[PDB]
Write a protein that binds this DNA or RNA. Sequence first.
DNA 1: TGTACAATGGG
Length: 180
Amino acid sequence: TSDPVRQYLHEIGQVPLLTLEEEIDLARKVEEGMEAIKKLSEATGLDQELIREVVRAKILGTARIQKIPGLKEKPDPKTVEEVDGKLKSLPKELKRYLHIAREGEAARQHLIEANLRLVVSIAKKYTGRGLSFLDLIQEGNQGLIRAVEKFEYKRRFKFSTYATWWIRQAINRAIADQAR
DNA sequence: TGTACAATGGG
Ligand SMILES: [K+]
Ligand SMILES: [K+]
Ligand SMILES: [K+]
């Protein structure tokens, strides 16, 4: 019952689970956001992932869970200001893609937050294997993030199905690495 | 590349 860990569990416990309908709606928004981000990259000559990360950094203020173990830190503030500057200065026709991209990353963050409880339930099955509980959570969280990136809502499978696959993969890979 | 029943206290 690590104080910081107990506090994380308390915090993710307040995030309600998504209904099927909401799940589909968020996943749809993430897809649309990635397509818009592609367009912004073509227009600006900037890396898609760099655009995504900056757009994310600008929607985190409205987020429910701020510090999530295992998640990539925001880029340095100067990179943010610079890239956010270029995106904001784009012509009318392109600024709608920016709106769609912002909606997508806001949706991604929500979808991730609403599944942190699943990561924890799986992690509990892997304790005493060389990684601390907190470490299991960090690795599981990175599997969750990968799940979100590759999830295809059109297959009509529940998100928990695909996330479980990835969270186990990530945790198993981390355990095998620790072991050498 | 692709990785997919559901699973979020546990069984
Ligand atoms: K019961
Ligand atoms: K009970
Ligand atoms: K029961």
